[PDB]
């Protein structure tokens, strides 16, 4: 039903938008009355680089799924790159993590189900990897769908963004940190780190080089066995294997028992978020 | 150095504003609705460093602002940054004036070290090529006089030193970090491309430099260059801080290689 | 900024011809009796305040051994050489740019309450022939509420640029903004004509008596017919014999920018 | 005997700006005066060409001339060294100047002016006692005169010159002649006669010259014909001033020429030299 909403919105121009509330801002189109999310990216790069980036950015039109954030368009204005997407009113899960402190386990199960289905969809249709799986890049609405966003779709834009924000927290797999072969197992590592981070609310153990050193030379932290059932620790220790050879692939995440029993549970996310806000 | 608000008119915006005050001036205004006292002491340190700098190769400080939002008044440079000349527009520079740029900015950093100033943020965006011939060094917001725990680094990771990155010392910032940053400026200056261009991961670059595995590649230096220049380039990028040469020897080497042209 | 240098500068030989030195690049050096000390501390006191792109950049001072003042080494020649020695074929846009740069430097100096008192084309240097540099602040001063109490000394310079009220010296302090305005008007005459004022006179005392009595003025008919009319009006009314009628420097900058933007 | 002149041929000895020098192949002592000019090159070539004019200027009352050349950005003028010094130095050393020496120097300057009139048709324009020199052998010569108008035009910028002995009629630009030099000679003779300006910015001196008459010497201190001589030399009207033929028949010049004065002996006693 969301497809026809883009159909009644034609050309998008910077003068037709207004300030409401890189950097991310919300925008609205006044006769339509819909809400759009604008991402602003600053780059000091060549004109030909900007045009091949925008030529790689059009691909997001055919990226259509209930597990992927919808897309409107992208253009150039005032020496800046503008990315227009459809707005999640619930925000990313990082902000509601700061709001609530901890998240009930079935909600993490539903998030895990959504992200693994999104990874399967992305690897089947475009054969590309996400590269940036962290709780700031995953979004929820007031309705209940959980979608991925800001994935590595444009290699030239990745080269442009390769040097910018400093990095306070890092969720990136070791095997790409040595510079070796990386695959979807990197995104699986990042997903496991994200879920344990929202499980306990803080990193359970410094400058960024110290985190890099701790990640490369030491095994990741593990949950106590006396608190939660052993199946969830089995989930996270299959997701936190250092060597990607025996680290679990998406097929035995699909036939894993915890994902099945979380799918069997009926968790109404919209009702709990409405109880959260009021 | 007090300037009241009503004489400075904020004409055009290119954060930074092109204003008019007894001439064209560049105004660095910090538009913060809630000024914390940390930004206050940072501003006081910045202006205290800027009052001690008077040299033709340094961007010239003229005044500051106190009320409304904090602002810094300096002269308006005509032209573009060395990053914009080298990686955005690709002006075809010839060899001679590239070594002229090198010796001029080396003179600027030598004067800063003589006046006991650590720039701490030496990179390509801080090099203004003023009417295409004169170099200016600016943005001393992180400049500090030597005389405690150092603040967290915030600049780009390319021009930092390995002992800056691993930061095992309380104050790893010194002359030799600026020397290595100048060496990276020389590296991009003689080649025209950013170092480690084959790596597109920020944390990978940070870790590979911090463990000392990665190094700049001198293979893209043309072989028609004199071997003293490539020897200087190899010497200024040396990892260990105690054998990196100081700026007067760098200037001596540059003038020695300049003198030999018939 | 302040503080003393050391023997890093070199002495080559123990009004000359060159006093150039070397201290992190090319620099310019100037040169125990009390009369030297008064002027020397006046020079350093006025030079600590000057930070502008049109003003010569003071670098440091030396008090030990001989008195010295170190400043940047400009590339090029003085304006007097450019008009009366080599006769460089300047275009009109260059001359108007020179005039507006000198006006802007004066506007900065007078807004920061400084009188050099001593304009001539000798003290104007063309840095790579593009950017003006105003220097030689030996006779500079700072105005104050007690500046009228002290009695000023003889300028003993060249009489072609001084004001009639200066050369009379009837008031205790004849110097003001308008004396510098008149000197800048003589500079405008030299830019727009190319020769020294009162060329038909070859006696300095003739000039002193004929100007100090208000009986002389530079000939305005030697201006070129293709000079701007507002430029002729400006150089005409900034050389008025009445002290009060001479316009201030903000008016001069406004007129110059108006005539620059008026030209198609 | 002196041929061409170059800078390397001169050896600096003493200062009299003036540096006492000598020419090493010849061995004679000269006086070399340096002036700084910021003038176009071809103009300085013309300055050399009509400073060659002084080759034909020879007289017992005019300073001898040897050569002129340009070197190191400085115009170099060379004249005969003549050791007794100017009347300003003699006035400072001796305090007063007696009246018979005044008659002798008046005769010397008037005969020099007549010689210049009859042989070169040019004028001095700068009569002041710094420009008249005295020799140990008693001869009184003249120098520093306006031989070439381009050099006046070039020097017309810097003079220092705190005082001025310039004629009144040459302050508003009227006709000028040797009468102005006669008037400045009157001021010089009165100046030394008393040893001071016997009455303070320079414009006030020009005002004082132009608007009100010059002072008188007292009759009790000098003979009456001396006051007659100076008051004929201090007439404001240019036509009423006596010309050279009138001063050569005045009573003071014939009594001074009739006087036999040991001027050389008195100046050698003043300077205290034994050759
Ligand atoms: C740490 N790993 S890394 O070193 O590989 N760096 C990188 N990682 C991952 C990605 C990139 C670049 C990236 C960025 C950041 C990006 C952001 C927004 C975007 O819009 C939308 N996206 C999805 C849905 C709707 C949208 F509107 C497209 C984007 O496309 C991109 O390509 C990296 F540089
Ligand atoms: C202030 N009054 S003013 O305004 O009239 N200016 C001027 N007055 C008068 C003259 C001039 C120029 C002049 C000067 C001063 C001069 C000086 C020395 C000289 O050497 C010898 N002289 C005589 C004998 C032997 C010599 F080697 C020749 C000179 O020849 C000159 O022409 C003036 F500029």
Q: Provide the succession of SSEs of chain B.
A: EEEHEEEHHEEHHHHH
CATH top level assignment of the largest domain in chain A = Mainly Alpha
Secondary-structure arrangement, i.e. CATH architecture of the largest domain in chain A: Orthogonal Bundle
Q: Alpha-carbon distance between the termini of chain B?
A: 49 Å
Strand content of chain A: 5-15%
Helix content of chain A: 40-55%
Largest sheet of chain B: 5 strands, antiparallel
CATH topology of the largest domain in chain B, anyone? Transferase(Phosphotransferase), domain 1
Oligomeric assembly? heterotetramer
Q: Which chains make the largest contact?
A: C-D, 26 and 28 residues
The Rg value of chain B, from CA coordinates, equals 19 Å
What number of domains of chain A? Answer: 2
EC number (chain A): 2.7.12.2
Organism (chain A): Homo sapiens
Protein name (chain A): Dual specificity mitogen-activated protein kinase kinase 1
Binding site for ATP (chain A): 39, 85-88, 92-95, 134-137, 150
Structure keywords:
heterotetramer; A: 278 residues; alpha+beta; Phosphorylase Kinase, domain 1; four-stranded antiparallel sheet; 12 helices; B: alpha+beta; Transferase(Phosphotransferase), domain 1; 2 domains; three-stranded antiparallel sheet; 15% strand; binds ligand A1AHE; transferase; Inhibitor
Overview of this structure, please?
Chain A starts with a helix and ends with a helix. Chain A has a 4-stranded antiparallel β-sheet, with no helix packed on it. Chain A folds into 2 domains: 7-86, Phosphorylase Kinase, domain 1, CATH 3.30.200; 93-277, Transferase(Phosphotransferase) domain 1 (Transferase(Phosphotransferase), domain 1), CATH 1.10.510. The radius of gyration of chain A is 20 Å and the shape is globular. In chain A, strand 3 (71-77) and strand 4 (80-86) form a beta hairpin. Chain A has helices at residues 3-7, 47-57, 93-100, 105-125, 155-160, 174-177, 184-200, 208-217, 230-239, 250-254, 257-264, 269-277, and strands spanning 23-29, 34-41, 71-77, 80-86, 138-140, 146-148. By secondary structure, chain A is α+β, with helices and mostly antiparallel strands. Chain B has 262 residues and is an alpha+beta fold. Chain B has 2 domains: 5-75, Phosphorylase Kinase, domain 1; 79-259, Transferase(Phosphotransferase), domain 1 (Orthogonal Bundle), CATH 1.10.510.10. Chain B is 37% helix and 15% strand. Chain B contains 8 helices and 8 strands; from the N terminus they run E-E-E-H-E-E-E-H-H-E-E-H-H-H-H-H. Chain B has helices spanning 37-51, 82-88, 95-114, 162-166, 175-191, 202-210, 227-236, 247-259; strands spanning 9-13, 16-20, 24-30, 61-65, 70-75, 79-81, 127-130, 134-137. In chain B, the strands form 2 sheets. In chain B, strands 1-2-3-5-4 form a 5-stranded antiparallel β-sheet, with helices on one face. A 3-stranded antiparallel β-sheet of chain B has the order 6-7-8. The relative contact order of chain B is 0.11. The chains are: A alpha+beta (278), B alpha+beta (262). One copy of the ligand CNS(=O)(=O)Nc1nccc(Cc2c(C)c3ccc(Oc4ncccc4F)cc3oc2=O)c1F is lined by residues 54, 63, 65, 77, 79, 125-126, 143-148, 151-152, 155-156, 159 of chain D. Chain D: One of its GO terms (cellular component) is nucleus. Chain D: It is found in: Cytoplasm, Cytoskeleton, Microtubule organizing center, Centrosome; Cytoplasm, Cytoskeleton, Microtubule organizing center, Spindle pole body; Cytoplasm; Nucleus. Chain D: The modification Phosphoserine is found at residues 154, 158. Chain D: The active site is at 126 (proton acceptor). Chain D: This is Dual specificity mitogen-activated protein kinase kinase 1. Chain C: One of its GO terms (molecular function) is MAP kinase kinase kinase activity.
């Amino acid at each position: 039903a969301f497809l026809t909403q883009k159909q009644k919105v034609g050309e998008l121009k910077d003068d037709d938008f207004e300030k409401i509330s890189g950097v991310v801002f919300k925008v609205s189109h006044k006769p339509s009355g819909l809400v759009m999310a604008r991402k602003l990216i600053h780059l000091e790069i060549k004109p030909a680089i900007r045009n091949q980036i925008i030529r790689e950015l059009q691909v997001l039109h055919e990226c259509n799924s209930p597990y992927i954030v919808g897309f409107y368009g992208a253009f150039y204005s005032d020496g800046e790159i503008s990315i227009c997407m459809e707005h999640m009113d619930g925000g990313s899960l990082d902000q509601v993590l700061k709001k609530a402190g901890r998240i009930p386990e079935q909600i993490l199960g539903k998030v895990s189900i959504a992200v693994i289905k999104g990874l399967t969809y992305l690897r089947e249709k475009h054969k590309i990897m996400h590269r940036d799986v962290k709780p700031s890049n995953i979004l929820v609405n007031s309705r209940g769908e959980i979608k991925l966003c800001d994935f590595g779709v444009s290699g030239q834009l990745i080269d442009a963004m390769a040097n910018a924000f400093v990095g306070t927290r890092s969720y990136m797999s070791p095997e790409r940190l040595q510079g070796t072969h990386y695959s979807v197992q990197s995104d699986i590592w990042s997903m496991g780190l994200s879920l344990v981070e929202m499980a306990v609310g803080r990193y359970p153990i410094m400058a960024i080089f110290e985190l890099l050193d701790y990640i490369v030379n030491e095994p990741p932290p593990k949950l106590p066995s006396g608190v939660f059932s052993l199946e969830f620790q089995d989930f996270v220790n299959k997701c936190l294997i250092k060597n990607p050879a025996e680290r679990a692939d998406l097929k035995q995440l699909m036939v894993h028992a915890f994902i099945k029993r979380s799918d069997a549970e009926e968790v109404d996310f919209a009702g709990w978020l409405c109880s959260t806000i009021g | 150095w007090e300037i009241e608000a009503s004489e400075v008119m904020l004409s055009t915006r290119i954060t930074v504003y092109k204003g008019k005050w007894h001439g064209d001036v560049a105004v660095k205004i910090l538009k913060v609705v809630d000024p914390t006292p940390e930004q206050f002491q940072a501003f006081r340190n910045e202006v205290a460093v800027l009052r001690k700098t008077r040299h033709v190769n340094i961007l010239l400080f003229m005044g500051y602002m106190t009320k409304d939002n904090l602002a810094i008044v300096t002269q308006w440079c005509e032209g573009s940054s060395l990053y914009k000349h080298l990686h955005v527009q690709e002006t075809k520079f010839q060899m001679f004036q590239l070594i002229d740029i090198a010796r001029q900015t080396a003179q600027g950093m030598d004067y800063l070290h003589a006046k006991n100033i650590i720039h701490r943020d030496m990179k390509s965006n801080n090099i203004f090529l003023h009417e295409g011939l004169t170099v200016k060094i600016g943005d001393f917001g992180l400049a500090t006089v030597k005389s405690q725990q150092v603040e967290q680094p915030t600049g780009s990771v390319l021009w930092m030193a390995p002992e800056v990155i691993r930061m095992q010392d309380n104050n790893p910032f010194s002359f030799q970090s600026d020397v290595y940053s100048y060496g990276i400026v020389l590296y991009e200056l003689m080649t025209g491309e950013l170092p480690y261009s084959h790596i597109n991961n920020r944390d990978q670059i940070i870790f590979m430099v911090g463990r000392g595995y990665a190094s700049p590649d001198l293979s893209k230096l043309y072989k028609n260059c004199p071997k003293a220049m490539k020897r200087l380039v190899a010497d200024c990028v040396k990892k260990v801080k105690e054998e990196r040469p100081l700026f007067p020897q760098i200037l001596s080497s540059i003038e020695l290689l300049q003198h030999s042209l018939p």
